[PDB]
Each structure stands twice: as structure tokens, then as C-alpha cells.
Paper text:
To provide insight into the structural prerequisites and find potential exploitable differences between AfERG10A and human orthologues, structures of apo- and CoA-complexed AfERG10A were determined using crystals grown from conditions of 0.1 M HEPES (pH 7.0) and 2 M ammonium sulfate in the absence or presence of CoA. By comparison, the root mean square deviation (RMSD) value between the apo- and CoA-bound structures is 0.175 Å, with 367 atoms matched, suggesting that CoA binding does not cause major conformation change. As expected, the activity of these mutation variants could not be detected in either direction (data not shown), suggesting that these residues are essential for the catalytic activity of AfERG10A.
Unexpectedly, AfERG10A localizes to the mitochondria in [name], as shown by C-terminal green fluorescent protein (GFP) tag fusion. Both knockout and inducible promoter strategies demonstrate that Aferg10A is essential for the survival of [name].
Numbering used by the authors:
A (entry chain B), B (entry chain A), C (entry chain D), D (entry chain C): 36 to 432
């Protein structure tokens, strides 16, 4: 009596630059535009949707119950339950898996899930009087670094963890800069062909002078293939530095949302749906924190097993491009050198709104699968962990 | 083939006052102490536990992946997966349901779940350069208020939500103070008889020169019956105010954790476990944000329906005492005036560490049920929601 | 045996915009530039100069002993004594008076004196732990407001003081806005003909890529004659308001410095010096804090009396344009609507670096005086006071 | 033509501990209390007093025109002119020398002058948006440290300057501790005989429980002769260090004020005055910033020559006890190791309100001279400078 869960629809905001277009738009406002567009496209009447689960990594100053904000700003009923989920970078995918579980268990027939992040709006932390010294210099941490990008156990940046997977699998500066230039080109190629028009939910940002409609990603046109090899290593300055701002993910503001359904709900409302797919399997996996870059290589086989398919049976892989080194290490271990991996670009060129990325790569995946094809979305997360989902694209049922 | 999920064991830190015994101990350090104790008391080999789900509502400056830190500081393997959950005050119960689902779907045989909050260590928020005015006065938000206790939709304290439920259900200042007084007395009674010794995991605070072992809830000895009628309203000062510091929960630091298992794991390892129980059902439910106080009245029936039991079959009820007004309104609507609700005290007297409280009431519940008895934990949460769990205490499986 | 004191030099930095070209350049580093130039142009060997007195009304985060910093950055010997003076907006004129007094008493034969402010660099104030509340919202004062522009006794902006001087002496919105347009045109006319080239000392700003040389006042171009009449009252928002951002002075970053000498030093080194003049008198005067705008009307008569001259003998008046309402009020009381007041514009168009403006309007006066002419510099200051100096331009002796 | 100036009265507040009795009382309120007393003991009719000059080193968040605030809170007329003077630690004595100059030129007949500092109330500095990085950790400077106690040129504490002076003049840990023990003992002797009753103006602190009258210095009782030789160096902690919290100035809150008069005003109203004295000479001197400790040794001879007296004609020396090492070094250079130096204690035991201390030592010096005796107040200040005043105590004329 374990049931099956279907993706009926998917939408994402454009991915804006750090301190760019979405500075005045909170993560839940971004969530709201992704959820409004997902429910519209699902063909499901809003009253069947009973829960909104949204990933959000940096919750500081977002106000009470971020997920609940997104739900309410999307115009959903106050009767719809909600939850903000933090599996760091995996938050968005994990949220989709949690919503699927509600359907798999018979507890609900329709769900919305995804993620959201406004990195521009994460704040600095001032401790209260009892945790301040009585005199002398105070250091205030940036939430982006202390909560987002700093390993607790080995007290260094995620960038250093990548440096140590880059050496252990012999992934050079040149190999990394090659993958990054290719991510930028695939993104430019996909935008010229307009491959993101149907998944994208435009954000109307207000203001004093204007009203601007943002409908295009920000940062994918910034490729200077000249400069890329001329960049300093951003994290390791002991001579052996290979990760740079060029060949790593950028910080971004953005959101993404999907509507999920039972077999019954998919049949009645979703048969022609463009993003219609079965959730075949999900899997989480963890190893040592420093080794978070290769966690996906642990999660993917568990997911493939639970789906009873081989690697060769998945048409498209979407792995989140945290760092070029991450993709190349994971390509090596799973033997995916000639697989379709991030064909339209990834987080190096399209951006990384942390809480959203897990569900944004799923939205991108579903739009580039043919009927009957298996897809895989996998994303690594800080602390040494990863979430992978197997999806089968469908025309009906 | 939906499997059954069993609580094998349960522990909680003491609940320390705001700016007290735990200012130096981060929420995940507190988490690790409750987890260490729960796994130890479970009798399950540590390698069979595959996931740690911790509730935590105010994640600011806790550092990356708060639940991951709790799991590692507990000595659990880096192979153990984690996720930190934010359903505001319901976070800790929701985390237990989420872990139960892993077992129900056959994805794991043993879990740890619970919650943690250090309200002392919640920072103030300073926005970055791009959100600050060029000149003129700046307001820094506390963070306890902006993220914890401030409604986004009606821009006012959770306390005003309590005031409106107090008027609507004609719950008097005197009725509130009388419940508050009873909460204090029940907590003093319980501490005199040492009724919390089994469930409490002492915390070792490495102080200035020496080291203090905390094993006693702080706050429950602070009843001044005489002064109770003359306390100022904390939130509403128009003459109609009824909710005070006296009849409201306090801010607190603490953590709580349980070990869950499959039938196979309980049989082989937990026969006769002191806190052994079946998770018979769970329910989430939501209504208008201002009516969050009464959301538990909507969830409890759904959870009783899914257990196939009636109110009268519930031996004891653990409802979170967010405000006296909350417990009285729920007692009215569900007709539980003559049922055993919060027999040993609650949040008014024993404290409210937001992210922990949902799992803290479950731990307290399990230690006061006889073999074969049914119990309900229920907890309201900001944005207008609640979750309720039905448990059946057991000698063996 | 009271000796006379003469002015031999006279320099000022360009007045940069708030958050303009000098954000990187500390008020002392600005002072040093204006000092280096004024000692160079004096002809006096640097070893004869024994003291540096500099105005600076906003000293927060400037570092130890601002005036000292100015002196040392200016290359002057550690043997030179310094003091930083705060008479709010009079600070710069006051420091010249006090340096003159050293010469008037026979304690020294050569002094540098003047003023400096970097309002861009004025900080916000965070109370230490003993003056912070244990929880809830904190207000951080700007300091441009709290220390700079806020009357202590009547808790309102210097702007409100001006409003009450604008009503009392019936000075209308249109009368203010006329004077402002007039000021803006006199500054353009002056810069077109390049009149400030002699008095300005260019500031080389060291940047991340190259070096910029700033030689031009920033803000005198910004006249939109039409928009002036539609600008909202800045300070008084009950309908009756007349004072605007446009008809008021701006916040600015700049410095000014003069070299003073004994008769003996003037004769031996400074005959036919461009700036050469005798300080014939000074006077300070104070009234009610709200009436600080009309305080130059109490100080100029006293200063004339001590000079032993009549109003109609003074060639050029330089009153600081703190507001348009100020200049007009003082034109009505002294009967100067028929005299040369601020011929080359003032603080409305040329800016207002608080601590510098006193000595700035002095340098600007000395450069537009012909031999044997009497000039008066006068400057109102917050708390209800003013400082007036009478000079006599000289070719020799 | 140059007159001479008379001290007619002298008052100070008790010197309160850092974060002690005056936390809630702003520097200008403390100045007001000291001014009220000095005016009241002057037996000058208030309206003859035309100017208030007060030292204040740390003006941040004190509000506009600190000296004006002291004047107005004292009850003096808005008629009265004011100025706040910043010569670091020499501020209060320089203020007295400036006010005298007004009398010595014939510009006034009666002046108030002194200093004030609330080091408890000095704030931390948050730069505005334009001087903050776009992301990453921020350091907030205390303000006591950055403006008060940090050398700009060398980038180290005023305590490191003392450590250099200590080693250059072979002043050992034991020698420094002996002077500090002696300072505490002399201060205890002076308090047991009530030798400060005449000069101390008690401060009334309004609380949220009642009123407190503070009449006694805080800190002079804290001597533990045992624990003094066991204290860790405070500023040089590499093992080389000699200066401790014990043998250095404390941080303190306090204020001090004298009334000054013409020969004509002394005669008509101050014959008999307890504190009555002539200002014989005043001198400022400057050397290398690291050498500030020894700047008094350069300033004293200049002040003596201008007084036309020799060292031996001085009954009592008050040198501000910034560091025990500062006193012992100047004693060596000037050959005053056997002279009457700080007989009733100093800043090491009696505290050190920066802006106040220069005039505080002057009022202490006046109350221990006999008629016809010469006294010297000398005080080193940050940036490598000092101010010395020579007075002659007088019973009349």
C-alpha cells in the first residue's frame, strides 16, 4: 500500500546575481513566484494541495516560518501546512523527497515542494550583551560564511574541501577551468536556444523610480575565457591552489517549486503536463565532512538500486556544480565521462541560490527528458552529505 | 507494505533559564548530550542508526548544518545522515514524525530525532552594506523577536495572538493565572518526587576555572502566588491586556532526543525498554496565523482518527504551555477539562526551548504512561499550525 | 605688550560629496594636504611653526589626537604641539583665533590653524554590553545626527531651529529657494572663471587600480532650478515646512589650513604673500539653542567694536550657508541686503565639512579681498553660538 | 597690556569605577555637578562668567557640543560661550590654560574650565554602508582603544610606549609595583583623613528604585599588596612585560572644574577663597609619539623658565600617574625622586577620567599648597605631548 508520487509541474525564478536584482525581494517572495507558477501549470485545483515544504539554508532575519511565508504570499489557504527544511545545499531536493513521502504514505494526494535563498539578504550576527566582552574589538561573522560556507569540524571554507578532492583524484587547475568555460558556453547556448523559457517564472520587482520584470538569469554572460586562467586561487594560497571564483559556484538569489501528486491526481489533472514524471527513487548518503564533494557518488548507486535501473539507463544527469572539481571527481567514480551531464550549464554559470539549487536542477532536468527516459538530480551538501533522486519522464498515467 | 515505528528511548537536557547555565553551550552541544543519552539507553548498536533529524527554529550563528553538529558531537559515525527541521515550535515533534516515516517506508531500521534551542545564543541581525541606509538611525532586530515570536502577516508578537484567543474563548486573567499557578505547583510536586531523573541527561558545562554539572530544570521554583495577579501584561498595554510573563512560557536553552526503530530492531534490542512505545499516528494542521493557539484542536482529532482511538482512550495529554490561554482554549474546544493534561507541569514552569519543546513533551509523556496506555503530545506553532502524535506505551513488541 | 597676529598662508582641499571621492581619505589626511600647501605658500621655514590647532566636530573612529595626525601626516616635526578643537560648526574659525592668541601673547611666532571633517567616515555607535538591553530591538544612532546635527535640549534636527528662524523673520520657501539658486549660480560662475584655483590644494586619492587627483568641488553643478521648487521639506513634515535638502547645506568631506605669524615673521618672509592679512579682532557670542541661526547677529557687532570699524567699511562678508534661512535672517538684522555676502557661493553649493567650514570661509574671504580692505568671516554653530573674525588685507608690513 | 589670571575655586566629582556608579550619568552631567560646585565656591556672581572650556577626549555619542551641555546642565545662561577641547589626557589642564588666555588678553573677567569623561559610556563604532565590505567578517573598534589608547604611528597600546620607557630608563617590575603600592597607600591615608572632602562635589544618581549620593572615589581600597607582584603584565604578554593593571591607571568616569578670574575679580570676591591661586605660567611640549611618557620632562622646564623659578622653589608636584613607569622616569630625568610628588595618591589608585584628569590633578594640587607656595600640575598625553602649569597658592590679592 506504499503508493507512488508524481511530479506534475516545476518552475524557477531567474537566478539573480549577489547584490543584484533581488536585493529587495525576500527568499519567500521569490518562493511565492515559483509556487504561483508551479500550481498554475499543474492543472490541479489549489484545494487539493495540503502541504508546502521549502528548503532555506540561511534563515536569519527572514522572519517566522519561511516556508509558511512563501505559501501565504503565493495565495495558498492558511489551511495548507508548511515546513522550512535545512539539509544545506541539498535543502531543495530533500524538500521534494519529504513531500513525496506524504503521498507515498497515503497522508496526502497533492503537495508543493522546492527551495529558496536570498544570499544578498543574509545578515551579519551581533551577539547579545551576555556574549559580548566588556571592552575591546568585536568580530561580527557574516551568516554567509559562519552558517553557509564554513565546515565546523575542520575550521575552513568549503573551497578547501574541494582542494582536497582535486588532489586525491588528480584534477588540475586546467581541467577545472576547462569544465567552467564549458559550463558558461552550455549556458549561453541554452539561453540563445531559449531552453529555460517554459520553466522560468518571471519576478516583477517593485521600487521608487520603476517596476522591472526580471525573466533572464544573471551571470552566465560574464565568461572572460582570457581571464579564467589568470584568476588567483580563492581559498588555498600556499602555491598548490587550484579552485578559483572562476571555476566555483557564485552566490545568488533565487527560488524553485514543484507540484507533486498521487497516481489518481496525476490521471485526473496532469496527463498532458510538460514536466510530468514519476519519482522512482530517492537516497541520502554521508561520509567525512572534508569529503562532501564525492558524497553524490555514494548517494547515486543507492538511488539507482532502489529504482532497479543501471547508470546506462539514465538519459540526463544534473549534478550541482558546487566546484568544477566536484563534477570531475564524480564523473571519474561513476564512469560518466560520455554521459549527458549538465548539458544546459550548471551552478558555475547559472548560479547557486543555496536552498533552491536542489529543486532548481530537478526543474532543469525534467524540461530536457524525452518520454520514458530516466533522469538523475544529485546535489552535495556541507558536513559531507548528498541527496540524489531518480525520475522517469512521462506523457501520461 | 507500510511498516510500524517504535520509540525505543528518550532523553532531555535540563531546561536552563535565558542567559543562565547554558550561555556557553551551543544548541547542537546540548543536542549531542540528549542524543548520547537516548542511544545509550536504547540498547541498539550505534551502527544501525542511519539518520539524525533535529528541530531548531533560530539557526543564526549555530554554524553549518546544526543537526549534523549534534550528530558528530554525539560520537555518531560521519556515515549517519542528518537534517535540521523548522516548523517553529513544532520542530522537535515534526522531526520525530519525519524520522518515523523513514522506518514506515522501509528506508531505515533505526533513527534519532528530537530538537534543540539555545535562545541565549540567538544573535541580533545587522544587514550587509547593500540593505543599510546611507545615513540616519538603524534598528537592529533581536532575532528571538523577528524570527521567533513575531507574526509576519499581522505585524505583532505571538503574545497578541494569545490575547485574541483569550477574548474569543472568554478566558480570564484569573483563569490564566490559575492554570499558571497549577503548572508551577505540578512542576514543584514532580521535582520534589524526582519524577524527571530517568529522562534527564545531565550537561557538563566547562566553566571559568572548574566545571559545573547541571541536572535540574531552572525556573520552576519562581512561583510568587501573591504577585501573580499584579504582573503587567507583557504584550498588550491598552487596558485589555491579560497575558503576562507569569502566565506565559519563558525563553530557555535545552535539547531532547529519542531513538526510533523498526519492529525487528525493537524485538532484538529494546524489549522492556523504559520508554518503549509504538508511534500509532501523527497529524499536522493549519488555520489563520492569529488562531495558532487553537490549531492543536484541529490536529488532535485528525491524529485520533488515524490511530482509530477516541479522546477517552488517552490516559495523559502533553500540550505545550506556550501561554495559559493556549491550554484553556484547547481544553474547552476538545472537552479535556477532566482529562489528565500536563500532570507534571509544562512550559510556563519547566521552560520552552522552541526547537526542543515538541520532543521534550514527548519525552515527558513516555515516562508517565503505564503498559498498553495511549498518550497524545500536541504543540502549536507560529504562522497558525500545530502537530499531534499518538503513542501507545509498551512492555515488549 | 599684546602683539598682533597676521595670516600668511591659506589653503583648502576641494569640498568632496558625502560618500564621494574622499570616502577612503581620513579627515586628518585631508588636513595634512591643506597644511602642506599653506606652509609651502607662507614662505616661512617649517621649523618656526611650533603649534597646529585643527577643528574636527565628529571625532569618532578618527584615531588618537586628530590634530596631531594632521600635523604628522603633513610632515611637520614631532616637536610641533597640537590640539583638536570642537565648537561644532565654528570649530575651524575658533582654532585660528586660539592660534592667533599664542602669537598675541608672545608664546609663538608661527602657527598653522584650521579645520577638517570627513562626514562619510563618521561611524554609527554601538553601546557596550552594560548599556544594551538583554533582548529586543536596539537603535544605533548615526552620529552625523546624534553628535552633529541634533539639538540636545529641544530633541530635534538643526533644520527645525532654522524653520523657527524662517517663520519669526518671515523668510518664505521661495525666498530660501531663490538664495539657494543664487548660491549655486555664484559657485558655477566662480568655477567657470576658475576663481578657487589659487586657494585649492589638490588631493591625490590612492585607489585599487591607479591614482586619481581630485582638484574640483563636487556638488555645485547639481542645480536643477525646476526640481528645487518641488522638493519636500526635509525636517518639518506637518505641512508648514520650508527648509529642504536643496535650500540647506550638504554633508561633505574637506579640510582647510592657514599659517599665522608675528609682525617680525610676516616682514622677514611673507611680504606681498597672496593671502597676507592682519587679524584685527575676534568675538564669540551665544543665545538660546533654537536661535543658533541668528547668533552671528550678536557676534559681528562685538567683533566690529573690537576692530573699531563700522558695518559699511567691510568690503566682503563670508557667512556660512548652514541654511538659506540663516543667511537671509542675518541679512535683515545687520542690514547687509545691500553688501557683498558670499560672492563666490557658500555651503549650499560649495558644501559643508563641519569642522573645516569655519577656516574654509576664511580662506575664501582672503582670496577675494584687495589691499587695505576689511573682511569678516562669521559662522553659526549648534547649541546657540557663533564666531566672527575681522581681517584687513595687506600687501606688506 | 597682558593681565594675569587667578584660580578662584576647584571642584571634582568622585572618580567612579569603569562600568560603576556613573554608567547612567553622561560626561556633561558629571561636568555640570563639578561646575555648579566650583561656581558656588568661587563667590563670583554667575553673570560675570562668560565662557565654559571643558576637556573631553571621547566625544562619541555624548551629543552635540559636550562643553555647551555641561554649561546648560550647570544652570549657566545660554549667554555663556563654550568649547570642548581634545589634547587627549592633557585636555582638562589645556582647557584651564585656554580660559586663562581669555583673561590674560582682557577678553573676559571670569571663566569656567575643566574636563569630563565617561569611559563607561564611550561606544563601539560601526562604519556606514560605504566603508563596509560587501561580505566577510567585520571588526568593530571599541573607541576607548581606537580613539583613547591606541598610538596611530606605531600601531600599539599606550601601555607599550610605557614598556619602552620602562626599559630605556631601567625601571623594573619591582620598582613600578613599589610606586603603585605607595600610590594606593597614600590614597588610603588621604581618604582616612578625609583630605578630599573640600574638593569633591557629590553626584546624585537617579535609579529605578531610588536615589544614590556618590561622595567617595572607587578603586583606592582595592590594593592587595600580596597579589600585586603576582599580576600578569596587561600589554606585553610575551614574557618581557612589566606594566600590569595594578601598576597602571584604571579607566574611570568623572569630571573637574575651576572658576578663573581677573586680578580685579579675585580682589572683589575671592580674597580668602580656599583654592585661591595665581596662574604663573603654562607650557605645552611634544616629542616622538612612543616617548609621550617623558614629554612632561620637556614641558616642565619650559613652564618653570616662563615662571622665572627653579625646580627647588616648587613645594608640591602633581604628575598624572598614567603608569608607575611614567612617574619614575620623569622623577629620574628632572631629579625629583626626593621631592613632594603625588602625596595623596594618583591615577593608579584615584582613577583616570581621560578628559577630566588634567584639571582633576590641578584641583588636588591647590588643596595641598600653603600661601606663597608654587605647585606644578604636569600631564603626558597620547601622540608624544604634555602640558605643565605653574601656580602660586595665595590667601589674597
Amino acid at each position: 500500500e506504499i503508493q507512488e508520487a508524481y511530479i506534475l509541474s516545476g518552475a524557477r525564478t531567474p537566478t539573480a546575481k549577489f547584490n543584484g536584482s533581488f536585493v529587495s525581494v525576500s527568499a519567500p517572495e521569490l518562493g511565492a513566484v515559483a509556487i504561483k507558477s508551479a500550481v498554475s501549470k499543474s492543472g490541479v485545483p489549489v484545494e487539493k494541495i495540503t502541504d508546502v515544504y521549502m528548503g532555506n539554508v540561511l534563515q536569519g532575519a527572514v522572519g517566522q516560518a519561511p516556508a509558511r511565508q512563501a505559501s501565504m504570499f503565493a495565495g495558498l489557504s492558511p489551511t495548507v501546512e508548511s515546513m522550512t527544511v535545512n539539509k544545506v545545499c541539498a535543502s531543495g531536493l530533500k524538500a521534494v523527497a519529504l513531500a513525496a513521502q506524504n503521498i507515498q504514505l497515503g497522508l496526502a494526494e497533492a503537495q508543493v515542494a522546492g527551495g529558496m535563498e536570498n544570499m544578498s539578504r543574509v545578515p551579519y550576527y551581533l551577539p547579545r550583551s551576555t556574549q559580548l566582552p566588556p571592552f575591546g574589538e568585536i568580530k561580527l561573522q557574516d551568516g554567509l560564511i559562519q552558517d553557509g560556507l564554513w565546515d565546523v569540524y575542520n575550521q575552513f571554507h568549503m573551497g578547501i574541501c574541494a582542494e582536497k578532492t582535486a588532489k586525491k583524484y588528480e584534477i588540475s587547475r586546467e581541467e577545472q577551468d576547462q569544465y567552467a568555460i564549458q559550463s558558461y558556453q552550455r549556458a549561453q547556448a541554452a539561453w540563445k536556444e531559449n531552453k529555460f523559457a517554459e520553466e522560468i517564472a518571471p519576478v516583477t520587482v517593485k521600487g521608487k523610480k520603476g517596476e522591472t520584470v526580471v525573466e533572464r538569469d544573471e551571470g552566465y554572460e560574464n565568461l572572460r575565457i582570457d581571464k579564467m586562467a589568470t584568476l588567483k586561487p580563492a581559498f588555498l594560497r600556499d602555491g598548490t591552489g587550484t579552485v578559483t571564483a572562476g571555476n566555483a559556484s557564485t552566490m545568488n538569489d533565487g527560488a524553485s517549486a514543484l507540484v507533486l501528486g498521487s497516481k489518481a491526481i496525476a490521471r485526473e489533472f496532469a496527463q498532458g503536463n510538460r514536466a510530468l514524471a514519476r519519482i522512482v527513487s530517492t537516497a541520502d548518503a554521508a561520509i567525512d565532512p572534508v569529503d562532501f564533494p564525492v558524497a553524490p557518488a555514494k548517494a547515486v548507486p543507492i538511488a539507482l538500486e532502489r529504482a532497479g535501473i543501471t547508470k546506462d539507463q539514465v538519459a540526463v544527469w544534473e549534478f550541482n556544480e558546487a566546484f568544477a572539481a566536484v563534477i570531475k571527481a564524480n564523473e571519474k567514480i561513476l564512469g560518466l565521462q560520455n554521459a549527458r551531464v549538465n548539458p544546459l550549464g550548471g551552478a558555475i554559470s547559472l548560479g547557486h541560490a543555496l536552498g533552491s539549487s536542489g529543486s532548481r536542477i530537478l526543474v532543469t532536468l525534467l524540461h530536457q527528458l524525452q518520454p520514458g527516459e530516466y533522469g538523475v538530480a544529485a546535489i552535495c551538501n556541507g558536513g559531507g552529505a548528498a541527496t540524489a533522486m531518480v525520475v522517469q519522464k512521462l506523457d501520461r498515467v
